Structures are given as C-alpha cells and as structure tokens.
C-alpha cells in the first residue's frame, strides 16, 4: 500500500571495460547495484530483468553509455524512476618522480546514475590513496616526522562530464606526496623529502582539495573525505567537507 | 583554507562498552567509535587528543541520557558548537526456541549516533537484524520445496523519544518469514521450516510490512529501512530500501 | 643471523589476463603475493624487483607462463627458493537448466607457485558458490526444507596441469543445486525441485566431492572445505577434508 | 561416503567472553567461535546443535585450564575422540604514555586454539600487535625525514607451557621501531617520532629480532611469525614470514 524508493538487485559482480583518458580501453571487474522505484499500486519489480541488461550490455562504459543504460533499465523494467551504481578498481600508469620508471597504481571508482522526479543526476566517486605527514610531529621533533598512508575520497555530483583521472590528480597534487608502486632509490629520496617539505594536517588536506573542487564548474556538489591511518596510533584521523553549490 | 569543515576528528577507535538492556541488565560489548566536530572557517585544527580522552574518562553503562551527556561534554571539551558521536557494537539477546524453549543467544549489530548541528540535538538508532526469507514464487511454481535464504533487515531510526533496540528487532523478527535461533532442536527445526514455508515474503513485502509498523510509532520521526536477501539460487542479493520522514 | 623463509611484497593489486578452457582470453584484476627465501648471511631482499616483474610481465597467464614467472623471479631477485601467489575473480558463461538463458557466474581463483629444496610445486584453489539443502529439515517437515547458499573451496596441489573449470564442475555437479545468475520461471522451478530431490548434509557434500578428487591422478593432495551459511542460524556449518595421496 | 572427515562443526559463532589478565583481572570481550570434531568413516554426521549448547552452558573466565576443560567436554558431549576449538577476540591493555604517563587503552586481536588429534592435546596462541615501522633506507639516502608506516606483527605460538598474551605483545612492542598509543601529548608525540627515527628497522630485521626472543622461550615449542608493513610510499605492503619448530 506504499511505494518503495529503491527495489532491485545488489552485489552483482560482472566484468567491465572503461575507456581511459589516454584512449585505451581498460578491462576490470565491477560490482553492480541496479534498483528501480516501485509505485504503491505495484506489488513487485521484475528482478530477472536487471541481470539481463548487464548480460545484454556491451562496449566500453562511456559516460554516454552509462546514461543510455539508466534509460534502458527504466524502459525494460517499465519504471519512471531508478538508480544504477557500479564499483570497480581503476589503474593509471604513473611515472616515478626522478627515475621515470613506469608503474601502475590502483584507485577505487564508483559511478552512480539516478533518474527521479524528471531529473537525471550522474555522480563520480574516486578513492585516491596518498601520503600525509603531520606538521606538528615535524615541528616539535629534532629529526624525523610521522608519515602515514591516507585515503582521499571525492564523491562529486557532475554538472558536466568529468574524467575520474581529473579527480585523481586534484587529490595527488594537493597531497603531501602521491603514491607510486615502483620507486628507485633516487625516487625514495625525493618522495621522503617532498613530503617532509610539505607537511599537511587532515584539515589542511580537505581544505586544499575543496578549494579546487569549489573552483570547478563541472562539479555542482561533492562530499570530500580524507582519512589518515596514523602510524603513531591504532585509530585514524578523519575530515569530511560537504558542498552543494546550488545552495543560495 | 578559509572554509569551515563539517566533520573533523578520530575514526575507528575500538574501546570496551557497557550498555543498558530493556530489562535494565547491563551487557558488556566492544565498540568502534567515531568522534568528530565542526570546525569554523578561521580555525586551523581541532584537538584529536581530546576525543580519546573523553572515551577513557567516560565510564558506566551507555544509557540514552548518558549518550546525550557525552555529546555535550565532547562539544564542551573540544570547544566546538557542532559535532557527532557514532558507536557500533555487537548486541546479544537471550532467545527462547519456539517449541523446546531451549534458551540461546543471538547477536545483532547496533549503531547509535548522536548529532548536534544548527543548535539541534538528534539521536539515531540503526540495528541489523538477521532473519530468514522464503520466495513466494518458488513456493507456487514448484511441485515441492521453496527456496529460502538468510536476510538482513536494517532499521536506521531517528528517535524523537528513546526506543530500545529490542523494540526495533521485534518489528523485523515478527515481520520476517521466520526468526533466527542459535540452538534449535528437531522439534524446533520442523517449526521454523514449516512456518517459513507458511509465510512466504518478497523483499518488497518485507520492507512494506516493516514500514507500516515503523510508521505507527510516534517515537520514530524518520527512518531508512533496508532489506537484503542473500538468494540461494544466485550469487547476488535482492534489495529494497524505504525512506520516510514524518516531518514531510 | 637466521634465514627468513618468506620475504617480499604483499597485496599488490594488478591487472591480469587468463585463458579460458574455451580458448578465450579473460581479463580480470588480481592480487599478488610474491616472496623469496633470505639466507641467514643475507641482510635483505630487493623489494623494487618484485613490482618490476609484474610490470615487465605480459601475455595470458598460462600454466607455463606461471612457472616461467616463478623462475624469472628467483633469477631476478638472485634467490634459490621463493613463492608466487595471485588471487583473482574468474567468470564462466553458464546456461540455465530449462530455458538455456546464458548468464555469467563469479568464482574466486587463487594460483600458487613455490620452489623450495630443489622441488617446484603448483597449487590450484577455487572457491565455488553452490546451493545446499538439509536432508533432516526435509525429512521431519510436512512442507518445505531449509536451503542455504554454500561455498565449496578446493585447494589442490597439482601433479598435472588442471583447468580451474575442471574443479568448478566437480563442485557444481556434487552440490544439491548449482548457482546461476539469470533464471527464468521455468528455471526457478527446476532448481527448487532438484535441490529438494537431492538434499545433502555438509558431511555428505565434502565426502561426495572428495571421492572425485581422490580418483583424479592430476591431484596429488588437496584441502577441501564446505561452508553452509545456514538460513535458520546466524552461524555456518563447516566441514574440511585433508588428503595427501603421497602418504603411505 | 566411506571416508573420515578431519573437521566437521559450526563456524563464525559470535558469543560474549570473559578472559583472565596477567594481573588476574577479568576483561569482557566478544568472541567468534569455531568448534569442529573429527568424524569417523562409518559415521554419517556430527550433532551441530551440541556445539552451541557447550557455548551457552560454559561460563566464567576463559582460563587456560578452563580452555582445556572445554576441549575435553566438547569431545565428551559430541562423542568424538578428536577435535579443535578456536576463538578470536579483541584484547585491551591499559597503556602508559612514554613521557606524560597519560593512561590509554590499546586493542589487540587474539586467537586461542586448542586441538586434540592422534591422542595429543596442543594449545596455540596467536596475537596481532599493532606497531610503527621506519625504513632505514629512507633515513640514510634522504637529507631530511624518514618514511614510516603502521605495521602488523603476528605471533602464532604453540605453547608447551602457558604464556600470557602480554608476554607475546612485549616481544613485538619492544622489538618494533616504536609502540602505538591511543592518547599521546605533545611531549609524547616528540618521543615517538624521535625514537622511531632513532631505531629504523626493515621488515627482515623486525622478524629476525622477534624470532631470537621467541627462540629463547622454553614455553614456546613452535611459532609462525609474520610482519607486514603498510608502506606509506606505495599502495602495497612489505612482508616477512619466519616459521620455526624447536622439535626439528
Ligand atoms: Mn600527528
Ligand atoms: Mn525466488
Ligand atoms: Mn538443517
Ligand atoms: Mn622504505
């Protein structure tokens, strides 16, 4: 006797191909969460149809194909509102700072689509691993400064199409240092020095990243998180910034 | 860096906890704490150290009113005007088997959240209840048998007035095809298998039946109800979400 | 002043391509654990070299390439003993029982190589999701019978090259019913009936699977596990069988 | 089906636990239990129900001797001659900060295993100690700074004579670059940053230093020691394993 906002399949693991900024087609494994709105006067959705769209679907998952999948799901399941969400690991070939030795780095990307109330919204979320270094530990200590691996997460509601790599760079750029999978000894020296030279508190990280998200038209709203897995503790330091530019 | 941060603090701090039962008995459980505060735009950083001190000093059972005293003490000790406390912990209920009566303990995952922002104190209670599901379709189409799977019903509830988790569990255990038990006897296995078969329910029916009972409690202003069936026939889960705010 | 049996990198996520029994090349994401033995008179291994073998390596990961990687690692790291281990999700296009509707299913495959004491050993481990159904619940109940999703894991030490798909079939074949991602209504009926018709206890599952591993020459030893995620309980039923045919 | 099963029983049963401290104080913690028995070849199946009954009836602190009484009661109640009990739980130790002395609790993950097979009773103790690591290479090559990461040292120890976990933690906390604390003050952050810098250690050095101290305890017949550095500079971990059996 009541409508259900989300009703559908969840945790469907299924192969995916994305297209890199470099034009390459990247093959990965995704986890899909496809759901639809059920009108009160409807007893139940057709669950076999979700798995069928995933099997029928083909090609690289471009921004346009993503939107075409959301519409195809609503037409095939006979719905007016619904959401599609896929999570997958994404890889970028990076270049070491001094040696130039190429190596891959792994990011976690979640892509979401949602049509409700005649409005379609696309969301880009990337978790970017980075190195942080406390400025206090550096300032009060004769030698050394505590450093920890950090996870910067950018859940951005796109006003225009934004490459995930555009969000990864903002993260790596405003971080004390960015992670690389292979580092030569000349490279270990530079990363250890540049981090010490650029110590940033979690409040500084999220602030420095937010300013650049603020200044981007393609981002109408975003949730920004930064977690420092403190070496000196068994807990983490956490900071979240929420901004909807449509406010006002 | 001239920008406020809605949430800065410590994350994933495990620490021993004592809570108060509906009976008023105290249960000892381990908790994972999240303590964060709002940071003004002209403030460089909050005191991470103080958040842990509040956990070490705090003692005694975690009564609702005690949870509200802690949220104020946090703002008072970290010199903030807004902030949130989150704590999740396993919760046990001695259960009575349906036919034999053999007592057995069942575990649940409870999360309490308090939040002060814009001069409003809001308390939440989220519980995960483990329950059995049985497909109405399998039962009708098949000559014999009916596929059944373990389900997870999650009730996140903003409580205008305090409500025991026991009260939340009941709405889910009662509205499920059948409740779970740790110890069952041959008499009790027959009842659970027969009763579940006699009350088949789709993920859509389950959330709808739990919503109607959550809609009828004055204490619960708002809620986000989730039901996930781990389908035996597939390696993917069925899902349904109902969100209701009684203010709107 | 002492040797270290395993010393190296761990949790290196990195893209992988395997070749299916159907000749196809399957692209997936792997997690690598590459380690080497350190002689007492050696202070430390070269960790940058592990990541370099992964970046340098190419082609589908065939059984032969896997062995050639283990040797290349020992030669490149200047070791006499060492281990390589990659974990990745693997997909098979299955056909529904009555409708024939094709759909993918996801398995977790771990491949291990180890050279020690002049002996090289290759191990194949596949986790196969399956449906189980209690024979007691069926025997003591007027209607219905409890059914749960199960995970059958086969860690087999190969005496000859064995396709992972050969191990997945043994698992799906001796199970009450095998999982399919897309099932039509004719298909739901068959899977619900065949399971009820073939109820098997966890002790029966592992026994029925072991007999077929026993009778396979390509398997010199294996660890077999079966976990039933009981619908009627919040815990699981577990059975493990260990067999080394070289015993005697 | 004419084949023995080395391990049949229940898995992942969470249940509240009380353990005894080296001080003799009792600590309340939640446990996840694994109770299995050996099944003869001519036996169709063990009684799953009895395993949970043993957990409900059992009370009082989990003293070593009490753990050994439970292993016998299990074989006696399930009518078996071989079997294993495993229980893992968070463990806390009030810690004292190095300069200020501010007490703070730190958590560890402890796993106790008992095993009767071939008429031998074997007790084990596995603990995970959270510790900080600092690279000796970064310290030498770099002009300023030194990269540091949180590490996990795991000691699995077959105990001929009972040993408190406190004794295991000490060997790891002492042999690490620096121990972890929940609450630290500006004086204590300086000490930890300086001390860790003053005692750099490679994953290989750490396991080697912990082994020598584990080799010198008569109570510990055998052990598998693991050390994993979550390197800040990379998204992958350093690893080292040392396995020693003092019988061989
Ligand atoms: Mn710090
Ligand atoms: Mn069904
Ligand atoms: Mn049963
Ligand atoms: Mn290093």
Q: Which of A174, A167, A161, A159 has its CA nearest to residue A90?
A: A167
Name the residue in chain D with its Cα closest to that of B48.
D183
Q: How far apart are CA B172 and CA B162, in angstroms?
A: 18
Cross-chain Cβ contact C181/A51 below 8 Å: yes
Would you say how long chain C is, in residues? 248
Beta bridge partners of A103: A94
Contact in structure between B171 and B216 (CB atoms under 8 Å):
no
Ligand 3 center–CA B242 separation, angstroms? 33
Largest CA distance in chain C: 71
Beta bridge partners of C32: C12, C86
Q: How far apart are CA B204 and CA B208, in angstroms?
A: 6
Contact in structure between C210 and C243 (CB atoms under 8 Å):
yes
Residue D122 Rama label (left phi>0; alpha psi -120 to 50; beta): beta
Which of D16, D52, D105 is the closest to B104 by Cβ?
Answer: D52
Contact in structure between D113 and D123 (CB atoms under 8 Å):
yes
What dihedral do alpha carbons A34, A39, A41, A44 form, nearest 10°?
Answer: 10
CA D141 to chain centre: 35
A residues 126-165 near B, CB within 8 Å?
none
Q: Which fold has domain B5-245?
A: Urate Oxidase (3.10.270)
Structure tokens at A63: 């921004």
Contact in structure between D145 and A195 (CB atoms under 8 Å):
yes
Q: How many CA atoms lie within 13 A of A98 on its CB side?
A: 12
Question: Cβ contacts (< 8 Å) between C54 and chain D: which residues?
Answer: none
Name the residue in chain C with its Cα closest to that of A52.
C182
What dihedral do alpha carbons C40, C43, C46, C47 form, nearest 10°?
Answer: 90
Alpha carbon separation from D70 to C136, D74, D78 (Å, rounded):
28, 6, 12
If DSSP codes are grouped into helix, strand and coil, which group holds residue B152?
A: strand
Interior/surface letters B19-42, b for 16+ CB within 10 angstroms, e for the rest:
bbbeeeeebbbbbbbbbbbbbeee
Q: What is the resolution of this structure in A?
A: 2.8
Would you say how long chain B is, in residues? 248
DSSP state of A129: E
Q: How far apart are CA B30 and CA D27, in angstroms?
A: 11
Alpha carbon separation from B166 to B155, B173, B217, D172 (Å, rounded):
12, 10, 14, 42
Structure tokens at B32: 């994972």
**Beta carbons within 10 angstroms of residue D119's beta carbon:** 7
Would you say how long chain D is, in residues? 248
Alpha carbon separation from B100 to B47, B103, C138, C237, D15 (Å, rounded):
55, 9, 19, 22, 21
Q: Which of D187, D160, D244 has its CA nearest to residue D210?
A: D244
Q: How far apart are CA A204 and CA A216, in angstroms?
A: 19
Domain residue ranges of chain A, discontinuous segments joined by +: 4-244
Ligand 1 center–CA D70 separation, angstroms? 45
Contact in structure between C210 and C191 (CB atoms under 8 Å):
no
Q: How far apart are CA B106 and CA D14, in angstroms?
A: 8
Contact in structure between C152 and C171 (CB atoms under 8 Å):
yes
Question: Cβ contacts (< 8 Å) between A141 and chain D: which residues?
Answer: 189-190, 193-194, 197
Listed in sequence order, the DSSP H helices in chain A are 47-56, 63-77, 135-139, 164-174, 185-197, 202-214
Which of B106, B180, B233 is the closest to C188 by Cβ?
Answer: B233
Name the residue in chain C with its Cα closest to that of A15.
C28
Q: How far apart are CA C242 and CA D15, in angstroms?
A: 29
Q: Which of D35, D16, D15, D34 has its CA nearest to residue D26?
A: D16
D23: CB partners within 8 A, 6+ apart: none
Selecting from 3.10.270.10, 3.40.50.1110, 1.20.1290.10, 3.40.228.10, what CATH number does the domain A4-244 have? 3.10.270.10
Structure tokens at A68: 């075409």
If DSSP codes are grouped into helix, strand and coil, which group holds residue A241?
A: strand
Q: How far apart are CA B75 and CA B85, in angstroms?
A: 10
What is the DSSP code string of C37-69? EEPTT-----HHHHHHHHHH--S---HHHHHHH
Is A188 annotated as a binding-site member?
yes
C23: CB partners within 8 A, 6+ apart: none
D76: CB partners within 8 A, 6+ apart: none
Q: How far apart are CA B120 and CA B111, in angstroms?
A: 20
User: Which residue's entry shows tokens 């991470």?
Assistant: B48
Cross-chain Cβ contact B16/D28 below 8 Å: yes
**Beta carbons within 10 angstroms of residue C68's beta carbon:** 13
User: Which residue's entry shows tokens 């070299």?
Assistant: C49
Would you say how long chain A is, in residues? 248
Q: Which of B237, B241, B211 has its CA nearest to residue B226?
A: B241
What is the DSSP code string of A96-124? -SSS--EEEEEEEEEEEEEEETTEEEEEE
D183: CB partners within 8 A, 6+ apart: B49, B52, B53, B56, D97, D102, D103, D104
Structure tokens at C97: 């029982």
Structure tokens at B82: 């807004």
Dihedral sign (CA A51, A55, A61, A62): negative
Name the residue in chain C with its Cα closest to that of B189.
C137
What is the DSSP code string of B58-109? --S---HHHHHHHHHHHHHHTT-S-EEEEEEEEEEEEEE-SSS--EEEEEEE
Chain A nearest C-alpha distance from C203 (Å):
29
Query: Does D6 touch chain C if contact means CB atoms closer than 8 Å?
Result: yes
Q: Which of A115, A6, A82 has its CA nearest to residue B207?
A: A6
Burial class of residue B243, CB neighbours in 10 A (0-12, 13-18, 19+): middle
Q: How far apart are CA B223 and CA B245, in angstroms?
A: 7
Ligand 3 center–CA C148 separation, angstroms? 10
By DSSP bridging, strand C12-19 and strand C25-38 are antiparallel
Contact in structure between A151 and A224 (CB atoms under 8 Å):
no
**Beta carbons within 10 angstroms of residue C184's beta carbon:** 17
């Amino acid at each position: 006797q009541m409508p259900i906002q989300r009703v559908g399949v969840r945790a469907v693991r299924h192969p995916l191909t994305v297209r890199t900024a470099e034009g390459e087609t990247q093959a990965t494994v995704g986890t899909w969460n496809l759901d639809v709105h059920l009108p009160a006067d409807q007893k139940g959705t057709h669950m076999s149809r979700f798995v069928a769209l995933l099997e029928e679907r083909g090609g690289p998952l471009t921004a346009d194909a993503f939107r075409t999948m959301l519409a195809t799901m609503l037409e095939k399941l006979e719905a007016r509102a619904g959401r599609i969400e896929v999570s997958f690991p994404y890889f970028v070939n990076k270049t070491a700072p001094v040696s130039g030795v190429r190596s891959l780095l792994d990011y976690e990307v979640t892509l979401t689509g949602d049509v409700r109330d005649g409005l379609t919204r696309v969301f880009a979320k990337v978790l970017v691993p980075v190195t942080s270094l406390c400025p206090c530990s550096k300032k009060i200590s004769q030698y050394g400064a505590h450093n920890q691996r950090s996870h910067v997460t950018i859940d951005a509601e796109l006003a225009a199409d934004v490459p995930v790599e555009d969000l990864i760079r903002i993260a790596e750029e405003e971080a004390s240092c960015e992670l690389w999978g292979l580092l030569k000894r000349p490279d270990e020296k530079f990363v250890t020095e540049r981090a010490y030279e650029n110590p940033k508190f979690v409040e500084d990280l999220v602030r420095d990243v937010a300013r650049r998200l603020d200044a981007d038209e393609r981002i109408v709203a975003y949730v920004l998180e930064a977690e420092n897995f403190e070496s000196i503790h068994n807990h983490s330091a956490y900071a979240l910034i929420e901004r909807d530019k449509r406010r006002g």
